[PDB]
Amino acid sequence: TVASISSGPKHTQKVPILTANETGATMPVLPSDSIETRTTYMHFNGSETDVECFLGRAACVHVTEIQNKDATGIDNHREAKLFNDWKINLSSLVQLRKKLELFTYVRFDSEYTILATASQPDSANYSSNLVVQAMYVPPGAPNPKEWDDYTWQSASNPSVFFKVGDTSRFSVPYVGLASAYNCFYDGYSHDDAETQYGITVLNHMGSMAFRIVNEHDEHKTLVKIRVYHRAKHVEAWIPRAPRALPYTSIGRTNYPKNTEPVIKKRKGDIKSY
């Protein structure tokens, strides 16, 4: 492939460099339209800018935490982090979010990796070996109330059991209801006067919910869960302007008030170098 062809002096009536940008086109002008060039080859394919590659590496999408401790007398397991959850989403944390929102609709399979590490902030004789159980409670399923409810039987709901310190990995097909996931949605769930706007209304997909299977030892053990997400088989439509201001909320486009100028001011003139 040639990156530049050889081209010499020109004295024409045919001027490729004068255009009318009002038309909305970006005319494909090249170095050889306005200087004299020599042949050179590309030596490159643009492999690593493919959208599959761009969205295809694991990104941290969520960090949560649960603890193993005596539940005796706990009136609210959920509240003691005897177990927890994450009503799923991927707007949660912002590095991957800016990448996805370069597109309007996106379609892909997900590969999740879940790393779990334990901490024992206060005096323990040892480090126990805990097994985590992460189950996905698809909306409608009967969400779970104590850390050892009938829910955890998970007879119809996919669940994975792995050890703290290890990693769990599995992959979920594209579960969207439509043909693509909306990265943006300028609508409502119905025409009510006070219903919510954006896409937190469309991105209702239950949520994964973790717990330790082990009963309690004499000390307490903090287990912190990190969920990583990798898109595989990516398809993206309609590019948009990149995010300039900071994010404030999962699912709304809102930016913070009295934010700071995002364009760097010159130290000098327009004329400055």
Partner: protein, 40 residues
């Protein structure tokens, strides 16, 4: 070799090697030729 039955479980896809910027760079209704005048 796929070891698994479902398609979601296969590895990453392989390069589009599609590449056609004209839907974005030249969505004009009447075709513009480089070198010919923009507005006639």
């Amino acid at each position: 070799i796929n070891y698994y039955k479902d398609a979601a479980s296969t590895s990453s896809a392989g390069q589009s090697l599609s590449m056609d910027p004209s839907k974005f760079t030249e969505p004009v209704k009447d075709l513009m030729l480089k070198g010919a005048p923009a507005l006639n």
